[PDB]
Amino acid sequence: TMVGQICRYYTQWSGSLKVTFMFTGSFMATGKMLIAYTPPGSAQPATR
Amino acid sequence: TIWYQTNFVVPPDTPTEANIIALGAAQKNFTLKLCKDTDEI
Amino acid sequence: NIVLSYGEWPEYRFYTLSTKSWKTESTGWYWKFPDVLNDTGVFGQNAQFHYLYRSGFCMHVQCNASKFHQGALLVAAIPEFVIAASSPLYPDFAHTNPGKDGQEFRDPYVLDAGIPLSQALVFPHQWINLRTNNCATIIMPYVNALPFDSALNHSNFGLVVIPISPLKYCNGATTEVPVTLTIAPLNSEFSGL
Amino acid sequence: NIVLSYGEWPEYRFYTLSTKSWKTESTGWYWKFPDVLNDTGVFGQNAQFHYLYRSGFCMHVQCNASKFHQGALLVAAIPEFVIAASSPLYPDFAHTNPGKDGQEFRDPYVLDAGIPLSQALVFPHQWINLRTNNCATIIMPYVNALPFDSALNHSNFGLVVIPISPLKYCNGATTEVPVTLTIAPLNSEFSGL
Amino acid sequence: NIVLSYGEWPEYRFYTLSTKSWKTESTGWYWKFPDVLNDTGVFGQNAQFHYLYRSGFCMHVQCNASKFHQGALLVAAIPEFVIAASSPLYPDFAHTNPGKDGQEFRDPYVLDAGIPLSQALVFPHQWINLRTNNCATIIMPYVNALPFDSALNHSNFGLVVIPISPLKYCNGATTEVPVTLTIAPLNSEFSGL
Amino acid sequence: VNEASVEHFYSRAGLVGVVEVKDSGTSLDGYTVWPIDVMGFVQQRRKLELSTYMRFDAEFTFVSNLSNSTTPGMLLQYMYVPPGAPKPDGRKSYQWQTATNPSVFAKLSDPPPQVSVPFMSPATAYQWFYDGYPTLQYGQCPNNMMGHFAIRTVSESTTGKNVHVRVYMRIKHVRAWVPRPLRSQAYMVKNYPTYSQTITNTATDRASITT
């Protein structure tokens, strides 16, 4: 990313981020997903 | 973490595999401090 | 659109249960609950610790299928839904409290209550007709003879999903159709910690 | 919708170039132009005869595909786009001025500039996602260090179309998807006949 | 009367810890806490789950003894209280986080910090003089260099109770004097579940 | 309009029970205890199950005669043991003298006695369908029981004649709640829903769907 390349010029960054997803499949395809986020202290979930 | 919920459902004569692209960016309140020399070059 | 059971609002977060696969041969499911949320979440710990509770619910059934699939489902909310044990007597505890993963009907025709399914439209209900619409939504107020009751012992109502018209598709289509359920407690109360 | 590069209007007819076939295995294209129109049309004769010119452009990429095709394209306009020659040194003149028929990337990943494609979104860009939309439109103002310059020698910017997510289809569908480009010069000027 | 540490109110239920027996030969105790409540109560579960917290405290030391007992105690609240390891080097984890049952001083004279006890009156303090009064109360605002910090890793302050003047009684009196402690969190906050 | 109504649909007196004191034969007891049960007959069980919740007052009438239909003058006691009170052991038991058990003394030559029983349940309304365990017990709510009627001929020892009683109950001031389907399958056991393994069809068969 561009945000991650300029953070290598500085020592310390602080703030909030953003992430976006685009589904590239067909127009006829249907489904569902689950997108989860975990705080810095916790270990990642082992089940949905 | 991204989890399959339910399943990927398709009609006849439609390709069964698809892709997702992820786009990261900073927010409006992001800030940068001190200075350093990149180790990328 | 929204269905408001018995014209009452349940006046005084979203829990997504795991997905069911509806195959051409499946006979349907029932979740029978205050119960589905007893073992999961922060609502599930309140239900253990407090000695009395009063809560209404809002529940959302959604079905992902293409335009080449066809079928229909009846979605009903039945208060005081009691299971019967077919002779060659008592229903097992797995059947009377199926849990968060639900139970699958042995007899879809009598709803295992001995009552006919033709007349199950007298309860609050919706249709999912895969050509017309993919979703059904029902808001259920708190119905009981008493103002408060126990979460572990007593089940206020069931939720029942019967595939009235079987699922058909041409070769090459996805064999099973995912059916998912979402429950948001409305206006819950507790006492007697 | 329309994309206005760098928030500037190019203040101070439509040319339809031949169609490209985008096959599942193709690596993308770049037109790099004031140049595409030098050899075609009435704009192409002005560019030969006059000694200085200033012009902005408006360019329109369109993609004809069905609902059973899937894929994605990134469409970017990159100023001062310079080609590099991969070692085992200079790029050939066919690569640095591809003409009206464009050139096909050797390395789509570095854009043959040595810069990464992940960060190519810093330039004015659009997405063509075959489910969402079939078209992309970009208006490019005149960017140069000088008020006027030469049409034959200097190329103000490139136009780059990379198939980020490959094209897939089931058997029986049309193998290639036509990709066509349309350029309308805006606010062009000339001097020194 | 109430002692307000550093003249600040901790602006932005009662926990009764087990009783200590103060015998004529005992050397004193320290509870060193955000920590005492980490493993007990509903405050103890918040401290596990959330990633940041800010809280002030109010703590109450009380001593039940007759009119024939005599003695005195110094009750102090010392921020950033750090334990030292006397040579013939590091203090063990039992000493640096004593828990809800506290720890007993090895050296009461230097407070195991290397600093003298004579000057410990520079911190917020009270006296319990068994003839004058049986109780001491201290309200401690949140002191840190940062607005928030971690409950498990960092200990904001200690609470230290030293029997400066030993306990004496005539034969027939109760040998030990119960010393009990009560902590009420004031204005606690949490984030990062 | 008013002829089909929940008030008018549960209305007229009907036969709840048939009991006999029968002290003449090898059974010398001379008393009987009859638990109050509105569902004793399957056709009144099916109508009450059109509703999940009901609240009503009861009207009990006792039509009594000997076996040959003749009704000579002889004195009977109809007691009422409310829910939670102990039931008589025998004809001479002391539990016939309890002042809190209302009783009626009426001869067989009199018109049939009748009394009214108020709504007895702790819950707001009787619930004929209960889901969950109260404490085999599945679906069993103790709140419904209305009590007992103990009947005896008042005599010192062993009169040699049997008395047949028929009890007529009438639902009053009835209120009903959430509607429910009417049972298709035949009942088997008294308390539970359980139905036979052979599923009988609601609509009767015809040769083909054309006609």
From TrEMBL, chain A:
It is found in: Host cytoplasmic vesicle membrane; Host nucleus; Virion. Signal peptide: none annotated. It comes from the Viruses. Belongs to the picornaviruses polyprotein family. Protein 3AB: Localizes the viral replication complex to the surface of membranous vesicles. Together with protein 3CD binds the Cis-Active RNA Element (CRE) which is involved in RNA synthesis initiation. Acts as a cofactor to stimulate the activity of 3D polymerase, maybe through a nucleid acid chaperone activity. Capsid protein VP1: Forms an icosahedral capsid of pseudo T=3 symmetry with capsid proteins VP2 and VP3. The capsid is 300 Angstroms in diameter, composed of 60 copies of each capsid protein and enclosing the viral positive strand RNA genome. Capsid protein VP1 mainly forms the vertices of the capsid. Capsid protein VP1 interacts with host cell receptor to provide virion attachment to target host cells. This attachment induces virion internalization. Tyrosine kinases are probably involved in the entry process. After binding to its receptor, the capsid undergoes conformational changes. This is Genome polyprotein. The chain holds residues 422 to 469 of 2201 of the full protein.
TrEMBL record, chain B:
It is found in: Host cytoplasmic vesicle membrane; Host nucleus; Virion. It comes from the Viruses. Interacts with capsid protein VP0 and capsid protein VP1 to form heterotrimeric protomers. Five protomers subsequently associate to form pentamers which serve as building blocks for the capsid. Interacts with capsid protein VP4 in the mature capsid. Interacts with protein 2C; this interaction may be important for virion morphogenesis. Homohexamer; forms a hexameric ring structure with 6-fold symmetry characteristic of AAA+ ATPases. Interacts (via N-terminus) with host RTN3 (via reticulon domain); this interaction is important for viral replication. Interacts with capsid protein VP3; this interaction may be important for virion morphogenesis. Protein 3AB: Localizes the viral replication complex to the surface of membranous vesicles. Together with protein 3CD binds the Cis-Active RNA Element (CRE) which is involved in RNA synthesis initiation. Acts as a cofactor to stimulate the activity of 3D polymerase, maybe through a nucleid acid chaperone activity. Capsid protein VP1: Forms an icosahedral capsid of pseudo T=3 symmetry with capsid proteins VP2 and VP3. The capsid is 300 Angstroms in diameter, composed of 60 copies of each capsid protein and enclosing the viral positive strand RNA genome. Capsid protein VP1 mainly forms the vertices of the capsid. Capsid protein VP1 interacts with host cell receptor to provide virion attachment to target host cells. This attachment induces virion internalization. Tyrosine kinases are probably involved in the entry process. After binding to its receptor, the capsid undergoes conformational changes. This is Genome polyprotein.
Automatic annotation (TrEMBL), chain F:
It comes from the Viruses. It is found in: Host cytoplasmic vesicle membrane; Host nucleus; Virion. Interacts with capsid protein VP0 and capsid protein VP1 to form heterotrimeric protomers. Five protomers subsequently associate to form pentamers which serve as building blocks for the capsid. Interacts with capsid protein VP4 in the mature capsid. Interacts with protein 2C; this interaction may be important for virion morphogenesis. Homohexamer; forms a hexameric ring structure with 6-fold symmetry characteristic of AAA+ ATPases. Interacts (via N-terminus) with host RTN3 (via reticulon domain); this interaction is important for viral replication. Interacts with capsid protein VP3; this interaction may be important for virion morphogenesis. Belongs to the picornaviruses polyprotein family. Protein 3AB: Localizes the viral replication complex to the surface of membranous vesicles. Together with protein 3CD binds the Cis-Active RNA Element (CRE) which is involved in RNA synthesis initiation. Acts as a cofactor to stimulate the activity of 3D polymerase, maybe through a nucleid acid chaperone activity. This is Genome polyprotein. The chain holds residues 636 to 855 of 2201 of the full protein.
